[PDB]
Amino acid sequence: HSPLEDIKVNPWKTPQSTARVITLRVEDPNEINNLLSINEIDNPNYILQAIMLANAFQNALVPTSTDFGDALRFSMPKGLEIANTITPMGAVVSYVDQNVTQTNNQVSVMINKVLEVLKTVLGVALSGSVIDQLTAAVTNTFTNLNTQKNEAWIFWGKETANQTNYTYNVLFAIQNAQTGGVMYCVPVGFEIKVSAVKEQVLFFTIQDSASYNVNIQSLKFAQPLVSSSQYPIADLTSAINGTL
Amino acid sequence: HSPLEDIKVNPWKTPQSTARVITLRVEDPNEINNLLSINEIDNPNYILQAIMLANAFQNALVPTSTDFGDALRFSMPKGLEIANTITPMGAVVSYVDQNVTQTNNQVSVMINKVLEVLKTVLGVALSGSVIDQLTAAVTNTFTNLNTQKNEAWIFWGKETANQTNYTYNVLFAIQNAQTGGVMYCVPVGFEIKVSAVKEQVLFFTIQDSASYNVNIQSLKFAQPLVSSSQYPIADLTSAINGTL
Ligand code: NA
Ligand code: NA
C-alpha cells in the first residue's frame, strides 16, 4: 500500500541463481565407483555422457605407496592411458601433477592454493561457469569431513600422533555455453598429509590452522557431445550401476 | 613380503560405504525449482519419480511475512493441499510445524535440535538409512552458507545490525530397503532468525556460538513406486526442466 519508488539499480549485487541442484546417493551400486561426481550441465540430455566418463576414469584410480597407507587416488599418468581407450574418442587438453605445501596457515589459505591449481587446469572461462561448485568441492576436501569420512571417494591412510594421511577423489563434468560442442571432464586425485590427528581433521573448519603437504593429480578431457534423449532410462540406470 | 596374521575383527569399526554419489547442477532450467533435491535411492529407475515429487512440492512454497523479508519457504499447510493433487495418488504419513530456539549455544547444538525434529518425522528405521545426508543437509542449513548464498533454495530476508533472517528449502526423496513398495518424500521449509550480521553468518561454522529462533515446516509423503526404466531419457530431461 506504499508509493512505487523509481528503480535504484546496483550493478554489483549478484542476482539469485535459477540453477536446479539434484544430488543422488545410489545405495549398493552393482559396480563400485570411488569418484565423487560433480556435474555442471545446462542440458540433462548429456547426463548419461557425464556418468559414462566417470565410469571410465574409475579405472585410472591407483593405490598409494605403502608408506602413505591403504588408499586409492586418481593417477594422472594412468588417466592419460585410460583417456586413449575412451569412446567416443576425444582429446586430453591439459594435465597436472604438482605438490602444494603450507606451514601454520589457515585451512582457507590451503583451499585457495588448491583452487589456483584447478583454475589453471580449467581456464578462466571454464572456471567462471563452475566457480561455486569448484570452491565448495575444494572446501569439502579439507573440511566437512565428518559426514564424508566413510564415503566411497575418501580413503584414510597412516594415522600418527602428529599427522594424518588421506586421499580424496572428485570428478567435474562440465557442459554449458563455455564448452560448446564438447563436454569437459576433470578428474582430481588428492593425496593429503596434514599436521593433525584424525579426530581433529574430521572437524577442521576454514578458520583452523594446519600445515599441509598435498599432491594434486588431474587432467582435462574434452569429449564431443552425444545426446541420449532417444535412449531408454534403463540405459542411464545401467551407466550409474557401471554395467552399461 | 610379511607373514600373514590371523584376523583381529573390531565389530565397531564402520566399513567404507559403496554408495555412489552424483550431484547435478542444472544451469537455466525451463521452470525454476527452489528446493534443494537430496535423493537416497538404491534403484535409479525411481529417479524420475523422485524429481517429479520435487516438481510438485515446488507449488507448496509460499512467501514469508513482510516483517520477515522477501523470501520463499515450504509451507506445511499448502503442502497438504498440494499432496492431495499429486498422481499417482498417495498418503501424507506425518507433518510438523514447530519452533526451535536456543540462546548463546554452539551452532552444533542447533543442528542437533533440528535433526531431532526431522528424525521424528522420518522415524528410526528411515532416519538410519539416510543419516549421513540428513546430518550433512541440516549442517549445510546453518553453515557452509557462502558458496550457497546465491543459490535457488536459500532466500535472504531482513538484515539488521543484530539479526539476519533467511529461509532454506530442502527436499529428501528416499527409496531403499526401509521403504519397500513406496518412495518417501520429505520437503522441509526453514524460516531462520539468527543473532549475527550476514557477513558473519556466511562464514558460521559448527564451533561458532549464536542464538536462533527457527520455524521448521515439513511433511512425510508416501507414493507407491513407479519404475521408469521403459520410458525415454527425454522424459527425465523434461521432469528436471519441470515441463513433464
Ligand atoms: Na564463490
Ligand atoms: Na553421521
Author numbering:
A (entry chain BBB), B (entry chain BBB): 6 to 249
Give the text the authors published on this PDB structure.
The active ingredient of Bti is a parasporal body that contains three natural sub-micron-sized crystals of four highly efficient mosquito-specific toxins, namely Cyt1Aa, Cry11Aa and co-crystallizing Cry4Aa and Cry4Ba. Following ingestion by mosquito larvae, the crystals promptly dissolve in the alkaline environment of the gut (pH ~11), releasing protoxins that are activated into toxins through proteolytic cleavage of propeptides by gut enzymes. Each activated protein eventually self-assembles into cytolytic oligomers that perforate gut cells, leading to mosquito larvae death. Here, we use serial femtosecond crystallography (SFX) at an X-ray free electron laser (XFEL) to identify the features governing the in vivo crystallization of Cyt1Aa in Bti cells, and to track the structural dynamics driving natural crystal dissolution in the alkaline mosquito larvae gut.
We engineered a C7S mutation to probe the role of the disulfide bridge. By recombinant expression in Bti-4Q7, we obtained sub-micron-sized crystals diffracting to 2.0 Å resolution, which revealed a structure nearly indiscernible from the “DTT” structure. Thus, neither crystal formation nor crystalline order depends on the disulfide-bridge chaining of DS dimers. This step therefore likely occurs after the crystal is fully formed. In contrast, the C7S crystals dissolve in the absence of DTT at the same pH as WT crystals soaked with DTT and remain unperturbed by addition of DTT. Hence, the disulfide bridge contributed by C7 increases the resilience of WT crystals by diminishing their pH sensitivity. The disulfide-bridged dimer is unable to form MBO upon contact with liposomes (~100 nm radius; LUVs) whereas the C7S mutant, able only to solubilize as protoxin monomers, forms MBO regardless of proteolytic activation. The C7S, C190V and Y171F mutants, which form MBO, display the same toxicity as the WT, excluding a possible role for these residues in cytolytic oligomer formation.
